[PDB]
Chains A and B, each alone.
Chain A
Amino acid sequence: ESEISQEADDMAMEKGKYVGELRKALLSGAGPADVYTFNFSKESCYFFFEKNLKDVSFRLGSFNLEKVENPAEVIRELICYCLDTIAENQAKNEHL
């Protein structure tokens, strides 16, 4: 919660549309209509979400993230959960 609060305070907009920035940069809610830096950098292991609207620079993102202690913990979970979701969705497809 501390990172969310400090980002919202820093970016001159306290979650009024900063939640929009988070959900458009992280959850892919921002389309490629206007280019920004809405991605995660592994260089410092931080996700940048600077909304440089219309190439007019508004430094918004570039805030820290964390690195997995073991890539297996999430990669194996993904490789299992994905197939699980496929199976459950096919089952509900047959039911429907």
Chain B
Amino acid sequence: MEELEQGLLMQPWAWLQLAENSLLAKVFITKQGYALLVSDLQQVWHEQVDTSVVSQRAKELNKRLTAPPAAFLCHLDNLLRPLLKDATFSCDCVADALILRVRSELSGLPFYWNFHCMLASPSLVSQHLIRPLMGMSLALQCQV
């Protein structure tokens, strides 16, 4: 659909300011869910969502979260950063998966929205987190 696999691929490396993890990080601004991209060869620590799963993890992953899907599609839409301004961003290191939350914060209420980074969708991962490999060799090792 290219807004979570191609545009995410066309997202420059920018380590989002997490709180616990030092792994690779960048989040893509979409209208179809926030998109992480961490390419490190053979243990995917990736966080990718669509409108449906962000809706679900809004309605059930937090004790108090009445924010609809449109709320988080706007929060990401009203987000310009693969980084953190401090939408408060924080990391709770529970696994090697990069816990990358985009809080229910829009310059105002820090409404509760926490993460347990799942193993993201492999369709948008293996397609364009291995492109780093051959693209990187074929470009870098020749132009340098």
Contact = CB atoms under 8 A, between A and B. Distances in A.
Interface string A49-60: 001011011111
Contacts, number: 40
Interface in B28-77: 62-68, 70-71, 74-75
A56 B110 contact: no
B108 A53 contact: yes
B89 interface: no
Interface in A21-69: 51, 53-54, 56-60
B70 A53 contact: no
A17 B109 CA distance: 8
Contacts of B111: 12-13, 58
A13 B66 CA distance: 14
B109 A53 contact: yes
Given A12-B111, A51-B109, A57 B64 contact: no
A57 B68 contact: yes
Contacts of B112: 12
Contact of B63 (A12, A57, A58, A59): A12
B110 A58 contact: no
Given A12-B111, A12-B112, A51-B109, A56 B67 contact: yes
B106 A53 contact: yes
B21 interface: no
A38 to B, nearest CB: 14
B104 interface: yes
A58 B78 CA distance: 16
A10 interface: yes
Contacts of A53: 106, 108-109
B116 to A, nearest CB: 18
Given A58-B71, A58-B104, 12 more contacts: A10-B64, A11-B64, A12-B62, A12-B65, A13-B110, A13-B111, A51-B108, A54-B78, A56-B70, A57-B68, A59-B66, A60-B109
Cβ-closest 5 pairs across A and B: A59-B66, A12-B64, A12-B112, A53-B108, A56-B71
10 contacts: A11-B64, A12-B63, A12-B111, A53-B108, A54-B74, A56-B67, A56-B71, A56-B74, A57-B67, A60-B109
